[PDB]
Amino acid sequence: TVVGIDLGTTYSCVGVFKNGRVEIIANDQGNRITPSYVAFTPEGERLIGDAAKNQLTSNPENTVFDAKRLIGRTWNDPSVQQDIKFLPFKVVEKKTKPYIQVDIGGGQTKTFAPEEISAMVLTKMKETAEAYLGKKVTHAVVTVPAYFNDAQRQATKDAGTIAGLNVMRIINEPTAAAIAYGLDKREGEKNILVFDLGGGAFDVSLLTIDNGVFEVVATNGDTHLGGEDFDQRVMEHFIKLYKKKTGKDVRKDNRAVQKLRREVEKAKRALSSQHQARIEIESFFEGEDFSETLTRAKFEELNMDLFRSTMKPVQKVLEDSDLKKSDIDEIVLVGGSTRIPKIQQLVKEFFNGKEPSRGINPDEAVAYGAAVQAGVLSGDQDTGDLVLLDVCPLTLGIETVGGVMTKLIPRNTVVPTKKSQIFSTASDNQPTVTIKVYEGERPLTKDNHLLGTFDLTGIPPAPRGVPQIEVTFEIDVNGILRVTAEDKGTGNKITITNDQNRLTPEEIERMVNDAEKF
């Protein structure tokens, strides 16, 4: 049986379509969502989920969380370096990637790719499903943010493979939410706006939904804007406050910083229903206590620039779809951070008083949609009708003379899609031709994201400009790029190498074996 897993920054959730409906499956603690946490105890035990989160404050250096904020990123990504300040576990550079180093008991050190941490979370979600179903689960639909780039998508797929899952399809989070909203609606064509603000990433998608036919018209997001940033802002406010009042800098004491995290999380939840919240930490720093009152007004003030920045993607989506505010028939809110009253207010005010759709749990709707998609792709006939057209989030381009972004496949193109182009050589007997592919909307490549450098190899000796190599760039239904090449001369095998440093089957096998040790 194929399950849907929402692999989230802060929490994950697993559902299954069985007997004509979705079941969101409760974990072994009775909880319908599971924290995306992995911890290693002094005695060498690996904890995952609720048990891992519960011991954050006593064992912070060896409690791992927020791996989705690192997955598929390079070491020098400013999102990675900015987040290190608030993470208690050591982040170290390996293979141009941020790896996670922990102590596994007995003074023994171990380093993990973010993929491996996410694989452990996926394994726990798989196990939750296997307990409920009473049998092995080998196939899953796994979620990603709509605005995830090529590397982030592939890395999430690799996490699934490490966890023993054949990833049937990766599904964009707002699209899954739209399926939860729209399945079995028979209203004809409606324009649906999904506003998806979770623990770590933000997406906006505009879909048309028409009697089982779902199409993403436009999407735009920010893969490093979410609940964890709102917590960070408040954490940093109190770290600086303590330094001003006492002279003491607590930024390197991991117990102090993560005890503050724990209190900020509780406070943020309370402030969605109350107007004040108490922060209280007994052994904060060097024996001394820490007590502060956080008002809703102050919480909103500290984050207002981030909150107001959520309207930037909304306007980008309206522009690309050529729709006005009044053309939006339904607003679907998903992700835990859409519970924040000020977020709800800003969205309502942007759309001139329009209330969001009712009957949608923002913590569960994504998993619900993923579970439906899994059922449909399996060959179920008791599921509602589902035809899905989804898009690539980023314009793909090639770097040309002067550092210019020459567009190849535009943003918001329905996938799968491909584009071909003929390449030749610049010098006599040149054996290799290098192509640099970028992701983004700016005119110069220095202001976009490098996807990869691809080398056409084994070009046979000939005078400059004679070889004719057709290179095909295909984005698959998961949103992942494949680059291939064919010789179109009058008469060789052209192999392509790249600098993506992708996890090989050998490397994945080693990671599977390492995880069996616990």
Closest by alpha carbon to 24, among 365, 355, 263, 320? Answer: 365
Q: Three-state DSSP class for 133? A: helix
Q: Which residue has the tokens 């990766």?
A: 170
Does residue 103 have an active-site annotation? no
Is residue 173 within 8 A of residue 9, CB to CB? The reply is: no
Question: 194: number of CA atoms within 13 Å, CB side?
Answer: 37
Residue type, 308: R
Experimental method for this entry?
A: X-ray
172 and 374 in contact (C-beta within 8 Å)? Answer: no
Question: Are 142 and 7 in contact, with CB atoms under 8 Å apart?
Answer: yes
Residue 116 CB coordination number (10 Å): 25
- Residue 293: Cβ-neighbour burial (10 angstroms; 0-12, 13-18, 19+): exposed
Q: Tokens standing for 479?
A: 């949103």
Cα separation, 190 vs 193, whole angstroms: 10
Say how many CA atoms lie within 13 Å of 26 toward its Cβ.
Answer: 4
End-to-end CA distance of the chain: 26
Phi, psi values for residue 117, rounded to 5°: -65, -45
Catalytic residue check, 173: yes
Q: Locate tokens 């991991």: which residue?
A: 254
State the maximum Cα–Cα separation within the chain, in Å, rounded to a whole number: 81
CA atoms within a 13 Å half-sphere pointing along the CA-CB vector of 302: 20
Cα 68 to Cα 120: distance, rounded to the nearest angstrom: 12
- How far is the C-alpha of 299 from the C-alpha of 295, rounded, in Å? 6
Give the residue among 476, 479, 373, 449 at the shortest CA–CA distance from 150: 479
Provide the token pair at 364: 């569960």
Count H helices and E strands in the chain, helices first.
12, 27
How many residues are present in the chain? 518
In angstroms, the CA 59 to CA 359 distance is: 39
Distance in angstroms (rounded) separating the CA atoms of residues 51 and 68: 19
Residue 68 known to be catalytic: yes
* Beta-carbon count within 10 A of 270 CB: 16
Instruction: Report the alpha-carbon distance of residue 412 to residue 208 in Å, rounded.
Output: 14
* Backbone phi, psi, residue 500, to 5°: -70, -20
DSSP per-residue string spanning 44-87 = S-EEETHHHHHTTTTSGGGEE--GGGTTT--TT-HHHHHHHTT-
Judge whether 225 and 306 are in contact, CB under 8 Å: yes
Strand partners, 171: 143
**Nearest of 201, 203, 176, 181 to residue 192 by alpha carbon:** 181
Q: One of 83, 158, 196, 222 is an active-site residue; which one?
A: 196
Please state whether the peptide bond connecting residue 416 to the residue before it is cis, i.e. omega within 30 degrees of 0.
Answer: yes
Q: How far apart are CA 210 and CA 189, in angstroms?
A: 4
Q: Which whole-number Å values give the CA distances from 146 to 171, 183, 195, 200, 518, in the listed order?
A: 8, 20, 11, 13, 32
Q: What are phi and psi of 80, to 5 degrees?
A: -70, -50
> What domains are defined for the chain?
1-185+361-389 (3.30.420.40), 186-225+310-360 (3.30.420.40), 226-309 (3.90.640.10), 390-503 (2.60.34.10)
CA distance 244 to 203: 37
Catalytic annotation, pick one of 53, 66, 68, 83: 68
Whether the CB-CB separation of 33 and 7 falls below 8 Å is answered with no
DSSP 3-state of 451: strand
Q: Is the dihedral of CA 412, 396, 196, 311 positive or negative?
A: negative
CA distance 490 to 484: 19
- Alpha-carbon gap, residue 187 to 439, rounded angstroms: 37
- Beta strands at 38-40 and 63-64: parallel, antiparallel or unpaired: antiparallel
Q: What b/e readout covers 362-378, taking b as 16+ CB neighbours within 10 angstroms?
A: bbbbbbbbbbbbbbbbe
368/15 Cα distance (integer angstroms): 6
Give dist(CA 269, CA 266) in Å, integer.
5
- Cβ 441 vs Cβ 395: under 8 Å: yes
Q: How far is CA 210 from CA 189, 207, 350, in A?
A: 4, 10, 25
For the record, the structure tokens of 260 come out as 């503050």
DSSP 444: B
- Phi, psi dihedrals of residue 43, rounded to the nearest 5°: -85, 0
Contact 328/354 with Cβ under 8 angstroms? yes
Residue in this structure with the two tokens 């239904």, named with its chain if needed: 477
Catalytic residue among 115, 150, 173, 364: 173
